[PDB]
């Protein structure tokens, strides 16, 4: 489609430049704008026009970051000292395959297996890898912030949804299957006009088996197969020492950048058959620098 | 206290004999009365007096069974062929200590540890050992039968309460802590005019860990300590042939009688300080009749 | 169990004789009692005692008919001229096998398969063959009489439940799966206090496929596997003559009496594995009497 | 069917005699009993037993009069002077045919044509003829008495239902089709336990075409065909002078008794296939008495 030949004024060009600046510097909230540039916010908020422009530019930046640019782009751009690879080696997992799977999963290139699940016993490194990952995406949401009766109230405009120490009830199990597999909600179909558009990755950490759905004062098992069809499970069964601090965006960015450079030939070999359980660590097919 | 000098008539003695028969024949409901002796039920149901007497005698027999006679008397009435012993041996547990603890627990002689917990993965023998105990006692009740919002609605007049594959919610945890610890409910305290209401033993089977209380869409571990003060845990890990069938009342009675017949020296050594987790079988402490 | 040695009076014996008379003559409602014997009803209803006795005897007779005497005895009491065998032959079915299956089904001896489904184009005999078994049993109930939101109100005390031109909605599918399989509800288990409560046979006639569950304005197939495990399906294709005539209980009694006397091996050879579709006719194995 | 062995005492026999007296003398309400025999009512109301017996006898007499005895028997108890025959001659109708049709319709022998409709212009004798036939039957009801939302709430136990100056709305048109066609409501089937327990004759008088069903603020015609099927119509197109007075029970009884013993041929052919409109006179075939 040939773009419309409409020509803008100087104010429109400056507004577009400000939107580009907002998207470039990963500023997506009013508080972040105040913390990053108080001068521009103060100058803009002196009139009605600037107040309208702030909201309009914020919305446009959200849309551009979550719809027009791949999420992995806000993930990229000597590896043995990284904390992420050491953590993934402690729990006997291959860092390269996990990184490639994360790269493919955050771009909605894994099919119906839209959910990533972390499982294991207390202090084993789970809300630390999930929340480092979440802090590197442009916008992320959480199920804990939302109301109990509406756990999926706000999923549009987000790059990731985090469910921390979560359990699935029979009241919402029908809705969760829609969001854990990537199926759009009905209202998203209605306003967009198509049958499937938005999509959103989901990451879950828990201490117990979420395949068991609580019904009343008891538990059922009839929903196990459908839930297992849509998840990839990792076992964090090795406790970690308190010698490790918080995981930061730089560590995960470096880890993913290093993973993206190496050979991908192994990954699609697994991609013929996506398994519920992630493959375990090997030694014949390990990366030479990781030894 | 010297009993009152009241003298009964022929009808009173007949009614007392009927109550004794009802209590001795282990019949406590109208349906079992019709099934066992339809002639007497039909003869009584011919007038208002007989209809009143049916309900009065049923209530009196229930009270006598659940309050005046210890439950362990009903349970009591070669051993290799017993399925209970083999099932408990396959699960790395000593049948003798388990039997002694069951005998002491059903009589409310364990203190604050009023709950028995069976934990383990699918088909390992748990709704089997529990519902043969439930049928070995005069009257038992289920949390499953009760309403969702009132799990502990009916506990008066019961010798046992069974919670099958259940989960503890945060909206009912306050009543759960009281009922699983043997603490009498406030309504019974008010109605009976005393603070010495006995309380009912509880048995729980589950696939997951019930010390993680379901709150909202997450699980909390704040109560995990307190619950551990009121429960004894048994792990059922090994699985069992699909050929062994329903376990029966005769097997439970024989196992409990044989357990009671032996010595009672090792139990009170453990009873000095009760442990949350039931100890496993010992290599040399096993009874000669079981080695 | 030795029955209670209590002895009844003359009035008790007369009441028991009246209950037996009510059972023998298949009188289970007040209107039928008035129609059959107005003299005894008028004599009894002259005082409070007789009015109480009427209801007591009716309840006892219903209970004895439903729970203490097998229903097949009420059905049991040349064959080429019978209408039922001709109707079942027109639809390419063996009347002997159908009769034996009906006899085993009405006594709750089929396990999980408690439902009988008649399906086909209109005017093919479905209501006729089903509402003749219903009139042959002592007491029968109808799903159509009950409320729309509560289709399973009166299922206790019934020998058969009839669902005519029925469709399964998504709101009642949970209770429908339980009732069609012969399992009891929580209320029945709690009131009886026996967990093992017998179910009631169900017969359904319909013009469409009832495995498609109505949800909203759509039909779904997520329950089509559990429903087929509980049902036996017969196809009524051949249209019937416009002067077929209303079927009579005597025809059903004659057909079932003839079927019960014949050999059974051709039934339990198939009864190891129950199929969703009823086996079709076989001229080689057809009984020589009705050739 | 054999009556029960039970025989009554003196009190039971006296109660049965009192019930027979109540049924014979056409006393079916307490006010009628006080008006006809105040002495017996006063002696009965001395104690609780007589008060119970009064209600029991009234209910038994009502049931006997409305279920065990044909209605026409209450109606079958020179001919020029009769007012009914003169009125029917002034309306261009054959009195013999009307009498025979009334006799066959009061006994529920007309099939689906359970309703009788009188239509015509103001003051032409219609609340007259219809309320003189209702005075002859033991017990009758009226749609006027009942609530507007539930016009057919109390129809059990009546020999006739009168709908005076009526009109059919779209809210109840489904229920009326049951009453006007003679089919039982689901409540009657539920309580009695059968499929076709009762059926009540209906008589309707109106000044307009009742086949037009009122819907909202407009009129529909989609229900006309069924109403035409379930009804028989007469045209009272001639008004009457005010000298004529009321129509009594004696006139109706004499008219119906006279029509009962003339012939049953000119009706028998018509009963082969009923027409919506009642045939008019025919001087070719008219009875010599009134000719
Ligand atoms: N805010 C923090 N600052 C420093 N170290 C932290 C912090 N949070 C967690 N850690 C460390 O990270 C490791 C695991 O913590 P965490 O990732 O929260 O565990 P987890 O498996 O998610 N726990 P749990 O929620 O109890 O099942 C431990 O070594 C902690 O000491
Ligand atoms: N109804 C039954 N009839 C015959 N045998 C049975 C029955 N139920 C259980 N069994 C036998 O008992 C074994 C244990 O079953 P069960 O006691 O139900 O296990 P469980 O651990 O409670 N199961 P689950 O509820 O899946 O955690 C089975 O493997 C069968 O061999
Ligand atoms: N009341 C009746 N009296 C006489 N014959 C009847 C009666 N009802 C049905 N039949 C006959 O029996 C046959 C079966 O009719 P019926 O059993 O009502 O049909 P059905 O299979 O339920 N049809 P439908 O409900 O339209 O799918 C027809 O050929 C009818 O003529
Ligand atoms: N209460 C009465 N007292 C005396 N005569 C009456 C009475 N009611 C009716 N009549 C006579 O019966 C005739 C018919 O009246 P009625 O039967 O009420 O007519 P209708 O056509 O049913 N009425 P409507 O359509 O409501 O105007 C009258 O013209 C009177 O002669
Ligand atoms: Mg955590
Ligand atoms: Mg179990
Ligand atoms: Mg039909
Ligand atoms: Mg009028």
Numbering used by the authors:
A (entry chain L), B (entry chain B), C (entry chain A), D (entry chain F): 202 to 278, 286 to 499
What did the authors write?
The main replication protein NS1 plays a critical role in cell cycle arrest, transactivation of viral and host genes, and replication and package of B19V genome. Based on its similarity to other parvoviral replication proteins, such as Rep72 of the adeno-associated virus (AAV), NS1 is predicted to contain one nuclease domain (Nuc, aa 1–176), one oligomerization domain (OD, aa 201–270), one SF3 helicase domain (SF3 HD, aa 271–501), and one zinc-binding domain (ZnD, aa 571–671). The SF3 HD domain of NS1 belongs to the SF3 helicase superfamily, which unwinds DNA with 3′→5′ polarity. Totally, four cryo-electron microscopy (cryo-EM) structures were determined, which revealed the detailed mechanisms for ATP binding and hydrolysis and DNA binding and unwinding by NS1.
